[PDB]
């Protein structure tokens, strides 16, 4: 119900995996973002919670060259800091 307009960098990540809209739901932002890491195979193949994005656009949005998906606050900081809520 609550819609978001993602900022230029976060939008290029969602759009680079096949998403064509500009206003998203939180479910869609999390789907397309998780699909971006899977398509780009950014996850550590053995412990798939670790995400390497040092030479990736995701790293600019994140701040660090790597993160663990278990760090929810850190992931939600990048998500809401790079979107406009309506």
């Amino acid at each position: 119900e609550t819609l978001v307009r993602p900022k230029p960098l976060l939008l290029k990540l969602l759009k680079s995996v096949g998403a064509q809209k500009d206003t998203y739901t939180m479910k869609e932002v999390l789907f397309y973002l998780g699909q971006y890491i899977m398509t780009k195979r950014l996850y550590d193949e053995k412990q798939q919670h670790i995400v390497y994005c040092s030479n990736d656009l995701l790293g600019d949005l994140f701040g660090v060259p790597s993160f663990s998906v278990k760090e929810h606050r850190k992931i939600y900081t990048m998500i809401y800091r790079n979107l406009v809520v309506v």
């Binding site: 998780g34 996850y43 998906v69 278990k70 929810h72």
Partner: peptide, 12 residues
Amino acid sequence: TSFLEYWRLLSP
């Protein structure tokens, strides 16, 4: 992918 299960713990 075991990645996807980890990532689903983000939402709702």
